């Protein structure tokens, strides 16, 4: 009468380190609590007034940023439900590029209200059905909330205004300058063909002069020095070789078989003469710049210096391909002189020093080309990394705008209007699904509430004013962060807008993650293993 034995059946059959959780209280509420904890951890970084977080991973690498996806990447999340929500957020990041914090906040609010509904007496299936119906209703309503279209993408000022909002959430102090930079870089890219490639925007981070000194360059910048003595070319005729700048060798096996003294005396002289002839043949085509992906032989460098040819060595083949795209050249597999079609042209190639690092610049004078580069200055590596994340968000926003040109008001205006419309719809639906629909509508309040909380004002007053104005009939009125008291203003004139695809995909993924978390009824966790990572992830 002093110990409670394990119940016969599954409990006794379970392994040593394994864990089994079944039923509402033991599984679903625990999962909802974990998801709410994750959402609360990420919540404080939402919106322009979000606060950066110093996250140190297991490798003592410091990340300071307010990007939700990055924070979740660098956090050692252990709970399976939080892992599922993180997967949904990362899927949103991959599909669109922005809105991860929205996904996390919406999923957390949905799961909290789902717990509340289950407590009042609703079943999991009823909650899931109501959530799906409300998600369908929201997706139907969303196209009607579009306020304006991009209507142009080759302009500079207009696209900069479009991209300001996406990079106002991060780097709230100075977003106009970054918007102008990213707009110029993206407008250089994106030719008459409607296809826009994100990879074509390169970011080179050079330390020292503060981010206000950053610039956009039409070309590529490589942080290294030249192999030769020529360090500046004014009418570059770059020839790109994917082979080492050396005499080609047999792939099977090499062995110089010498049988007479004449061959021994003449071998090196003949090899030198052959390589000199090859280099002179390359130079005769007019190529004053040579780029190679392999090593450079000493005799090769000597004969290139003799004929005044600039040598640049690119170890990474991705950089070689990007340079070929930039200049318009073809990577020769051999060391043959290039024909006129394969010889790329760049209007200026030179060796330069920016701050401390030595750089080689392939600079075009036109405002065009396949690849454009943004050189970022700054006083800290972490600050430059955060600016790079903001640049990535802006570029992804531009890509989304190229895909779909429709926009919706930001600052919680769209969320408040969606909540109002879904509540109105659910007020008419009979049956137990109305509770789930109303809770789904209420879950949209977490966005303006989080914005107001981060801004430092009372959330309830802001939400009440938003409902009042929206009931009056103003669908473009949202939170005004430039005030010390709860206030709202029309945000079509303010230019604070969000991409339609971003909201659509964020809502879809958040609802899917919430319903998938709710569907789980039992958890059977195996004993944790200390393996050297799964082989899939290397």
């Amino acid at each position: 009468a002093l110990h409670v034995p394990k119940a016969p059946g599954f409990a006794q059959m379970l392994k040593e380190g394994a864990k089994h959780f079944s039923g509402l209280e033991e599984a679903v509420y625990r999962n909802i609590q974990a998801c709410k904890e994750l959402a609360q951890t990420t919540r404080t970084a939402y919106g322009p007034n979000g606060m950066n977080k110093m996250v140190i991973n297991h490798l003592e690498k410091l990340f300071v940023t307010n990007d939700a996806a990055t924070i979740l990447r660098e956090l050692e999340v252990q709970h399976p439900a939080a892992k599922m929500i993180v997967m949904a957020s990362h899927m949103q990041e991959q599909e669109v590029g922005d809105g991860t914090n929205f996904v996390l906040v919406f999923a957390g609010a949905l799961l909290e209200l789902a717990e509340e509904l289950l407590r009042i007496g609703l079943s999991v299936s009823e909650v899931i059905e109501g959530y799906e119906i409300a998600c369908r209703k929201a997706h139907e309503i969303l196209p009607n909330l579009v306020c304006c279209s991009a209507k142009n993408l080759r302009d500079i000022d207009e696209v900069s205004s479009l991209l300001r909002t996406s990079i106002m959430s991060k780097q709230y102090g100075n977003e106009v300058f970054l918007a102008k930079l990213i707009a110029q870089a993206c407008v250089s890219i994106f030719p008459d063909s409607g296809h826009f490639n994100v990879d074509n925007i390169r970011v080179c981070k050079i330390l020292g002069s503060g981010i206000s000194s950053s610039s956009v360059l039409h070309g590529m910048v490589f942080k290294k020095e030249t192999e030769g003595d020529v360090t500046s070319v004014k009418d570059a005729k770059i020839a790109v070789y994917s082979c080492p700048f050396d005499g080609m060798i047999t792939e099977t096996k090499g062995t110089v078989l010498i049988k007479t003294a004449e061959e021994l005396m003449n071998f090196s002289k003949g090899e030198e003469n052959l390589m000199d002839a090859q280099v002179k043949a390359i130079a005769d085509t007019g190529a004053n710049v040579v780029v190679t992906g392999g090593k450079v032989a000493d005799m090769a460098l000597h004969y290139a210096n003799k004929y005044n040819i600039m040598l640049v060595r690119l170890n990474s083949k991705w950089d070689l391909r990007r340079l070929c795209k930039t200049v318009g050249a073809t990577a020769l597999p051999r060391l043959t002189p290039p024909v006129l079609e394969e010889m790329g042209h760049c209007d200026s190639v030179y060796l330069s020093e920016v701050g401390d690092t030595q750089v080689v610049v392939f600079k075009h004078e036109k405002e065009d080309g396949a690849i454009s580069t943004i050189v970022l200055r700054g006083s800290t590596d972490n600050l430059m990394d955060d600016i790079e994340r903001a640049v990535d968000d802006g570029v992804n926003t531009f890509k989304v705008l190229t895909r779909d040109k429709r926009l919706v008001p930001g600052g919680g205006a769209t969320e408040i209007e969606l909540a109002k419309q879904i509540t109105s719809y659910g007020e008419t639906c009979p049956g137990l699904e109305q509770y789930a629909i109303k809770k789904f509508a209420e879950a949209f309040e977490a966005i303006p509430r989080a914005l107001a909380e981060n801004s430092g004002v009372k959330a309830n007053e802001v939400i009440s004013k938003l409902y009042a104005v929206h009931q009056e009939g103003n669908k473009n009125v949202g939170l005004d962060i430039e005030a010390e008291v709860p206030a709202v203003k029309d945000m079509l004139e303010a230019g604070i807008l969000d991409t339609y695809l971003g909201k659509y995909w964020a809502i879809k993924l958040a609802t899917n993650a919430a319903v998938t978390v709710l569907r789980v009824d039992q958890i059977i966790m195996a004993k944790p293993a200390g393996g050297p990572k799964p082989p899939s992830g290397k």
Binding site: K19, F21, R30, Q33, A34, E37, T41, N49, M51, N52, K53, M54, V55, I56, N57, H58, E60, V64, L75, E76, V77, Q78, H79, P80, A82, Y172, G173, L207, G208, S209, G210, I211, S212, T231, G254, V256, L257, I258, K259, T260, A261, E262, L264, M265, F267, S268, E272, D298, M299, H302, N305, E353, D356, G378, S379, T380, D381, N382, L383, G456
Partner: protein
């Protein structure tokens, strides 16, 4: 808290958030700034740091001291990073940046403790920094004459100002003249690799010399080297990248013979290959032979028999400097040793410097490179002399790029503080307090100078403030007379870029530190 049977994050994760976290960040930044406080000014002091290996490093340079410290506080590492940034972009001011950043954070700490929103502080810092940079650009003194004498004097004064805080401050005029002379002979890019720094133990500081040419240590001479003459009066120099040794023709080469006559022919062929290389070198008229690759004993004796000089295994950068000074070209092949690819110097000589043999290439009229030979009684002595000369070299290069100067000794910062206080007195009042805090924080450098000198910081600061308010822009701390003086008339000159970068970096660091509200530390993996 609750046990939470399945916990969210990995066990051992430490999280800190709220006002205490930011206050602790500010305190850590203060701790970091305290480690370099006494290194600022002519009355500054050096620091000695010993690593785990037992090797001690002695430095007055703020960036070096911060790098040596193994800082692990995430907020404190920002000060080290901005010091590195200031060293990279400018090269001077690595202590002022940290002092300014820590002073900004210290001044705004009371407002943080009251619950003021960090975004307001960040906006105030951004506004104050923009205004201060604009004021610096407005009031900086420049001369639009391009006079060579005036430009050289300005460069020398800037170098003296950059040098009057190090152990070589007693010979600051001598070293500043040397540094200006060295920099003025760089061609257009001012590459640092074109200025060689050689440290030879023994001798006084004044024994250090600048070679209008190139000099490097003797490199493992083989047998027969001592028969080579060690002085030439108009030598032609053959810069080569060639291994002058008896060796296998190629790594994969193989010789197959079936007759003793062919065996003798092969041996004589190897000897003839080497002798043909040597004869092609000799017929070029060159008297000094420098090679990047080894030169064997056979080649050494061959050159000694011809009254020639050889030096193999010369470091690549030394060969590059020799090419830039004498004016030849590094040849990987000796088949075409025309007069175009041969260097030329007035005098080549091998002398002894403190128990070491050095090869001197002097008399180069078209030299585009230099070589500092620094003499000192200790290894760390020479290292810190090199660091000081590097600071001076960066200052002189930046002054070459743009000849805009402001008075030092805290005069520029007192003027900026007065300007910012005057501006802040004309705004609503929420930003007024923060901009006034920024202006008060700019007064750290003159106060630190007075504290290091053993002065009365309060009285000097009061006199400086009154003088700036009642008229006078370049009035700063006079260390010698324990008073204030017109530092512009005292030739305490700094390039405007130094203070511009210092203010920009310090403001960025302060804004980054303030912008953080939560710190998360994941547990270490593979602690072992």
């Amino acid at each position: 808290m609750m046990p939470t049977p399945v916990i969210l994050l990995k066990e051992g994760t430490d999280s800190s958030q709220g006002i205490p976290q930011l206050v602790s960040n500010i305190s850590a930044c203060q701790v970091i700034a305290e480690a370099v406080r006494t290194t600022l000014g002519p009355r500054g002091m050096d620091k000695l740091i010993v690593d785990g290996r037992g090797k001690a490093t002695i430095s007055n340079d703020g960036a070096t001291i911060l790098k040596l410290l193994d800082v692990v506080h995430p907020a404190a590492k920002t000060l080290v990073d901005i010091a590195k940034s200031q060293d990279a972009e400018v090269g001077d001011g690595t202590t002022s940046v940290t002092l300014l950043a820590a002073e900004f954070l210290k001044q705004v700490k009371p407002y943080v403790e009251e619950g003021l929103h960090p975004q307001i502080i960040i906006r105030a810092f951004r506004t104050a920094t923009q205004l201060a940079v604009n004021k610096i650009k407005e009031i900086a003194v420049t001369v639009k004459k391009a006079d060579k004498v005036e430009q050289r004097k300005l460069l020398e004064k800037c170098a003296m100002t950059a040098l009057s805080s190090k152990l070589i401050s007693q010979q600051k005029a001598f070293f500043a003249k040397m540094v200006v002379d060295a920099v003025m002979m760089l061609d257009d890019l001012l590459q640092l690799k074109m200025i060689g720094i050689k440290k030879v133990q023994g001798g006084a500081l004044e024994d250090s010399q600048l070679v209008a040419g190139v000099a490097f240590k003797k490199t493992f001479s083989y047998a027969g080297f001592e028969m080579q003459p060690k002085k030439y009066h108009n030598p032609k120099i053959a810069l080569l990248n060639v291994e002058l040794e008896l060796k296998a023709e190629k790594d994969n080469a193989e010789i197959r013979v079936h007759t003793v006559e062919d065996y003798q022919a092969i041996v004589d062929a190897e000897w003839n290959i080497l002798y043909d290389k040597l004869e092609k070198i000799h017929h070029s008229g060159a008297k000094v032979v420098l090679s990047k690759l080894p030169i064997g004993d056979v080649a050494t004796q061959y050159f000694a028999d011809r009254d020639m000089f050889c030096a193999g295994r010369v470091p690549e950068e030394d060969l590059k400097r020799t090419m830039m000074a004498c004016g030849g070209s590094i040849q990987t092949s000796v088949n075409a040793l025309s007069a175009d690819v041969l260097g030329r110097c007035q005098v080549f000589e091998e002398t002894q410097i403190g128990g070491e043999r050095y090869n001197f290439f002097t008399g180069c009229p078209k030299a585009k490179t230099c070589t500092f030979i620094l003499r000192g009684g200790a290894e760390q002595f020479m290292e810190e002399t090199e660091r000081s000369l590097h600071d001076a070299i960066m200052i002189v290069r930046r002054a070459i790029k743009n000849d805009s100067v402001v008075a030092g000794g805290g005069a520029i910062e007192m003027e900026l503080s007065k300007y910012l206080r005057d501006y802040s007195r004309t705004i609503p009042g929420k930003q007024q307090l923060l901009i006034g805090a920024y202006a008060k924080a700019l007064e750290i450098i003159p106060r630190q100078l007075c504290d290091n000198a053993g002065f009365d910081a309060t009285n000097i600061l009061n006199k400086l403030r009154a003088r700036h308010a009642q008229g006078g822009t370049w009035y700063g701390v006079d260390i010698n007379n324990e008073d204030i003086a017109d530092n512009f008339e005292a030739f305490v000159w700094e390039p405007a870029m130094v203070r511009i970068n210092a203010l920009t970096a310090a403001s960025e660091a302060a804004c980054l530190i303030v912008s953080v509200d939560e710190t998360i530390k994941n547990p270490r993996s593979t602690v072992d």
